[PDB]
Design a protein around this ligand. Structure first.
Ligand SMILES: CCCCCCCCCCCCC/C=C\[C@H](O)[C@H](N)CO
Ligand SMILES: CCCCCCCCCCCCC/C=C\[C@H](O)[C@H](N)CO
Ligand SMILES: *C(=O)CCCCCCCCCCCCC
Ligand SMILES: *C(=O)CCCCCCCCCCCCC
Ligand SMILES: *C(=O)CCCCCCCCCCCCC
Lengths: 283, 235, 268, 60, 5, 283, 235, 60, 60, 60, 5, 5
């Protein structure tokens, strides 16, 4: 029944002391942190405490949309030699760094995912031409469903995959998704392989990436401009924002201290000196 | 249709908003939770855990294991400081990377009491009395035991209870301090001195290390969520 | 039963006819629904129906076919297969509308030394594929409706290339159930298997199934009976074994509406 | 189906309430209530098998 | 109707 | 009272067995599938089962808009030699493949139909001209009502046909329609003809398509750009999405295994080898 | 008008949404349902029906009726496999086209127990004992009866009850498996061996076929709806 | 005329409800409730005239 | 002021209702209820001064 | 303002729709009905009246 | 409040 | 008024 917005404990007034009770003395080898409060080592007054931990609850700490990817698409003149660009993104929070560092303060998590999509477009040639308002199709292709090979092939039919047809210049698109993991929580870290190398089989055959579980963990987003080719080429970006709603986290972890280098815990030479020079006896 | 009038804010996307939205996977069979050990409900739980201070950030000791070790020796008594630290838990380089420091760099404001615990790692035969000090702001930062004594302090007698804790009580003019260096919301000075001296018998190391730790008290809170400077993504 | 009753030994009696069997593998009631007359709550044509009862609801035996090592399979449609059977067929061609359920009894005995297995499938709306790659949906009425001789499945698709005068018939490829779907799944339709070591017959009781309460029997077939060799015929060490397959079907709870002069169809 | 809860009022101008109605069938579609619980830090700060009394020697 | 927290 | 979101049955713990009860032995010739559960052939533990079949209920399996057609219209310069293109589509789910394959897992169906319309436009000539926002008229012309012969003739009056005037760049248009079949269910397959050939009549006269019922089953959609001719030509597409709401299905069917070839069950030579090579004793 | 503020998601079309909309044919007289036999309420009902496996997908037997027939003969006992199959019900080529396999290719995840039933189609005079095996993942796929015996299995005695069923119990690390080939969510190995041998008297065929079937148990479920790869529309 | 039903809550942050009001006269205009029933597979899995007891011989 | 009425449900997925609130003062602004009555055709089909009994001679 | 999210169908004009709208002539004094003979309530009343067949549609 | 037809 | 399921 203690809630995140409740006021923290009052400081109780305490006076002088001369006894065998030794709060200040302790032993960190035990693995515990000494539960002390100021009235244990100094004289205190009575204070009625109003402050609360409401904004550092797990939910409040995460209650923000974070950019996780920028997808690029276009719609060129029909005369171009190059194909009309549609975009394919493997869903992940590890292509960017900030939400990643925040989630990795913890080992496991459960949450409902809110995705919000900001779409911007521009002209690329110093033409003096035009294009009309565009409609984008953001298709979720889950692991196993056919990935689009062309901007206009049969897979954009979406009879069973979820799609958003977003209209340019309208309010940014948004959907929610429940906790969809195949485990009882999302694992921010997996110390293991997806394959056992057997002796009786070749090394190549038993090989797999360190710390990787399912190759296509969550499938992909595929984005296209639905409009047909236009004489003037337009290029667009779809910025994807991720917010973890209704979140639970388990097993705390020291935050990332050196720059991210890939989706694993790996680090790059030359980035391993975070701390700066400061003299022991200098304030 | 019901008559309606669009107000300002209409169609905007605020990253901090809290609205409903359509579910892209209707009637999805969610996997139930199981009771995983180590559930956390508030980031300040993490700040109340002791993590070790990188006190010695000298050019040669920094970004190496050595930064965590404060060297002491059995030399004659002096009134000169073993270490000197600013109480700026999110910005002082020695505190900013502790677990408390890290969490504080996601918030703009902090308040509450903290505590420093030191661990003597010399031999059982080594004895000593040290003075651990906290001087609230506004005067000359203590460089001599004479000054440091006059502020909040603990005189630590080394023995079987291996460690000693000094509580930095919440003493501030403002109701919350900034998580950056700021003279208006400065916190004062943490320091350590020899009270007597480290004494050892023969056949014993004459030098050793103490280790220091910081954590938050139960009255400690943060607010105004913000991005940290402790990670980037250039290109 | 301790008085002798067995799963394997059945007697079915409809009208003036009886079927006995001593090697049955129980019997099937399609979709768990026994045949029934049309209820007032679901009725549609308002005229008094004719229900010929025992004169039409009795076991009619069709022409016997022969199962050999080269057999690819056989098919029939209902009510088409019965169009010329006694007073049932007559009631059918005299009325605009008719509906009927059926007991289908497929018969095939051999010996303890033979082997093979027939999949006997009752399919609602058994639409079969045509022989053409120049024109879809072009199987003529006459070829769609073989009457009691039925048709056969083929292991090979040979497209009709005579564009001047097209064959205009089906080309039902067996592993594709004659309709572009895999045979291994036809078990989701009401079925039994005649596996020669186990049983010598299949018995399917079929309800009237349709998107309507009653319809044109002459224009539309409600069920298709498809019989295919799941495991080939084999005997002793003979290279050309043959055993006969006989179909006997009885209409059930059949009623007819819209009486006029008789329909006289172009069947050849 | 309206849910009515109190706001914790910071700057002031009784209890002020606010109203919430869920418009969708899937709990995933819902906003966050922010009605959260705190817990004791003990599982991380005091994970020792024998209960620590702070006035007593941690080692005895 | 209404739930009140 | 068992509902689609209820948890499936618990596994009950079962121990060793030595008896005349023979669950493992059976006989598939009967036409039945053996109703076994793991505790019938192995030793089990007790498990409290949480999983449910909520997302594979008929409604949930179909609860998605599927593209069924792409209609093309334009609005050209008044000076063009070619007429202004209006579009006419025979309503059907069989012009595309994915929703079709899903419905054909079953023989008959009942549902309310939700139609959603996504409209996109573009410039066709490397002009440097313009057109202003367009309004589209999507007219339903049911069997028997006069089909438009010209983009602007009297039939677009729509005194009794239902029409949607859609404005370009607004949210995609949507309507609902009840179960409108003339039978008690939609028939995904009709093994029959719409005509009996009589002997006393010519063969031509008695002829009809195999498996076709009413020639104009559901009528047509007719779409036009309502704006008058513009100097710069614009071309638009109207993508139609179909969702079957409030659905009931009857008589299950093996899914389409080889490529669709026309609206019937016909198949094309060269497409009849779906299965791939795999050796009997190879995992 | 009532003051309103447009939130994100406004004006989007999500194909999975569930909203009301205007009826284009108001007061239409709907035709009532009738009680058509064969009503289905959930796609897993179809997955619990036995459909036949195309086990022998050899280059000459595939896409022909032969693919369904597993040939056995009265040869002397061997410990070599009659057949070997991966438990990947949506992706193994021998299972992906069964009715269960087909339905599973409209979903991303599956869970639950399955069962394999085999039908002996030799003559009444033919006898035999076979061993049907399921080895959960993680070791060498069984190629000899010696290995297969050690996993979940049924020793099938051929006789009057023509068929025998082996239940593959739900044994997985994850709460749901993927409907694609995936080493993390692999299911293990299905195999069949001769326990004794097929014995026949004289005047009897020495070779015959068994037929195999798969279906789901009552504890079997799927989730995350998706488009299948088992149909396309090129051009 | 408001219909109030419970959501089955998957990931958590009592019973949470949601509210539904039909705005049109035609049932066709309504959203899908997804309040559906399951049934036994028997009509397809066990369509035999004599009830099957799984411990007993299917053929006797 | 909410009016609650039942829908006649055609295709199915108790009584389903729908809600109507009039937002304007003028009845002219209102939608159509479609809650209409039928009547007997008699004034057009049987406009005779002496009641017709169909089993009897229309002329006697 | 009340948080709202525009659904599909927004801003369309369906000729068969049934919505309210503002009255251009507020407080207009409507002329009351009188009981005109021959009121019809359903088009099938008209279909039950006998009308004469043009049977002989020969060219002349 | 409410009228119910 | 309200129906509650
Ligand atoms: C129309 C758009 C629909 C988009 C639907 C996306 C659903 C995909 C679920 C993605 C869940 C991402 C969770 C984050 C990562 C995992 O925590 C870790 N790598 C461990 O499992
Ligand atoms: C303003 C736009 C109104 C559009 C109204 C369209 C109404 C047309 C009803 C179409 C129903 C299509 C149902 C699908 C096909 C049938 O299932 C099968 N071919 C058998 O009957
Ligand atoms: C419980 O909700 C009963 C009170 C209902 C008050 C009116 C609800 C406001 C409009 C809700 C729309 C429902 C969302 C699908
Ligand atoms: C039953 O609905 C009585 C409660 C009414 C609550 C307010 C309804 C919200 C607005 C409904 C508009 C009606 C749609 C035509
Ligand atoms: C009768 O209407 C009492 C119940 C009121 C429920 C809320 C009404 C919804 C908003 C109506 C706006 C009024 C239109 C001018």
């Amino acid at each position: 029944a203690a809630t995140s917005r409740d006021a923290l404990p009052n400081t109780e007034a305490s006076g002088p002391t001369h006894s065998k009770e030794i709060p200040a003395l302790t032993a960190v080898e035990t693995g515990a942190t000494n539960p002390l409060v100021p009235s244990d080592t100094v004289q205190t007054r009575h204070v009625v405490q109003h402050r609360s931990r409401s904004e550092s609850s797990i939910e409040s700490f995460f209650a923000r949309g974070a950019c996780v990817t920028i997808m690029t698409v276009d719609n060129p003149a029909s005369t171009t030699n190059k194909d009309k660009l549609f975009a394919v993104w493997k869903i992940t929070y590890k292509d960017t760094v900030q939400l990643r560092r925040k989630l990795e303060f913890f080992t496991y998590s459960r949450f409902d995912m809110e995705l919000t999509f900001v779409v911007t477009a521009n002209f690329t040639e110093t033409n003096n031409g035009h294009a009309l308002n565009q409609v984008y199709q953001i298709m979720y292709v889950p692991p196993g469903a056919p990935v689009p090979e062309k901007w206009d092939d049969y897979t954009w039919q979406t009879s069973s995959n979820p799609s958003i047809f977003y209209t340019y210049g309208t309010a940014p698109a948004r959907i929610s998704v429940p906790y969809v993991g195949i485990s009882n929580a999302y694992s921010h870290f997996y110390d293991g392989f997806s394959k056992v190398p057997l002796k009786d089989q070749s090394a190549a055959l038993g090989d797999s990436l360190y710390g990787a579980a399912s190759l296509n963990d969550f499938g992909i987003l595929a984005v296209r401009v639905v409009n047909d080719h236009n004489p003037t080429k337009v290029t667009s970006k779809i910025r994807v924002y991720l917010k973890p709603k209704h979140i639970r986290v388990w097993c705390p972890r020291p935050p990332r201290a050196v720059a991210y280098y890939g989706p694993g815990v790996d680090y790059k030479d030359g980035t391993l000196t975070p701390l700066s020079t400061k003299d022991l006896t200098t304030y | 249709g019901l008559p309606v009038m669009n107000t300002p804010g209409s169609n905007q996307y605020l990253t901090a908003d809290n609205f409903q939205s359509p579910c892209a996977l209707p009637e999805f069979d969610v996997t139930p939770p199981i009771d995983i050990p180590g559930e956390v409900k508030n980031m300040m739980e993490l700040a109340e855990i002791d993590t070790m201070i990188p006190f010695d950030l000298s050019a040669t000791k920094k970004n190496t294991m050595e930064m965590y070790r404060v060297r002491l020796s059995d030399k004659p008594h002096t009134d000169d400081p073993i270490l000197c630290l600013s109480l700026s838990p999110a910005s002082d380089p020695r505190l900013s990377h502790t677990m408390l420091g890290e969490i504080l760099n996601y918030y703009t404001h902090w308040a509450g009491s903290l505590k420093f615990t030191f661990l003597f790692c010399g031999s059982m035969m080594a004895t000593g009395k040290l003075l651990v000090s906290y001087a609230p702001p506004g005067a000359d930062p203590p460089k001599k035991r004479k000054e440091a004594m006059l502020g909040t302090h603990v005189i630590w007698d080394i023995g079987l209870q291996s460690s000693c804790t000094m509580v930095v009580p919440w003493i501030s003019n403002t109701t919350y301090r900034q998580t950056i260096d700021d003279s208006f919301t400065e916190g004062g000075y943490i320091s350590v001195f020899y009270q007597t001296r480290i004494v050892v018998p023969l056949s014993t190391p004459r030098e050793m290390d103490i280790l220091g730790f910081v954590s938050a008290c139960n009255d400690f809170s943060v607010r105004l969520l913000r991005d940290t400077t402790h990670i980037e993504q250039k290109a | 039963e301790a008085c002798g009753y067995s799963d394997r030994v059945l007697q079915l009696t409809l009208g003036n006819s009886t079927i006995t069997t001593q090697e049955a593998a129980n019997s099937v009631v399609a979709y768990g629904r026994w045949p029934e007359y049309l209820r007032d709550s679901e009725a549609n044509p308002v005229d008094q129906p004719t229900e010929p009862d025992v004169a039409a609801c009795r076991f009619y035996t069709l022409d016997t076919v022969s199962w050999t090592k080269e057999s690819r399979g056989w098919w029939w449609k209902l009510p088409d297969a019965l169009r010329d059977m006694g007073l049932f067929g007559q009631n059918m061609y005299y009325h605009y509308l008719g509906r009927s359920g059926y007991t289908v009894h497929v018969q095939c005995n051999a010996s303890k030394f033979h082997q093979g297995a027939l999949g006997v499938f009752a399919v609602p709306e058994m639409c079969l594929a045509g022989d053409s790659n120049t024109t879809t949906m072009h199987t003529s009425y006459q070829n769609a409706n073989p009457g009691e001789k039925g048709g056969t499945f083929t292991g090979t698709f040979t497209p009709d290339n005579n564009q001047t005068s097209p064959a205009r018939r089906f080309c039902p490829v067996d592993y594709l159930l004659g309709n572009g779907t895999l045979l291994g799944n036809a078990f989701v339709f009401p079925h039994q298997i005649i596996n020669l070591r186990t049983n010598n017959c299949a018995t399917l009781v079929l309800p009237y199934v349709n998107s309507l309460s009653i319809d044109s029997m002459v224009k539309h077939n409600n069920w298709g009976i498809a019989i295919l060799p799941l495991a080939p015929l084999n005997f002793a060490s003979e290279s050309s074994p043959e055993i006969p397959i006989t179909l006997t079907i009885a209409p059930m709870c059949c009623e007819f509406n819209g009486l006029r002069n008789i329909t006289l169809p172009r069947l050849q | 189906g309206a849910q009515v809860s109190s706001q914790k009022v910071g700057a002031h101008e009784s209890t002020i309430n606010y109203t919430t109605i869920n418009y969708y069938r899937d709990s995933a579609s819902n906003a966050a209530s922010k009605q959260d619980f705190s817990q004791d830090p003990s599982k991380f700060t005091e994970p020792i098998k024998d209960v620590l009394i702070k006035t007593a020697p941690m080692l005895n | 109707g209404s739930s009140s927290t």
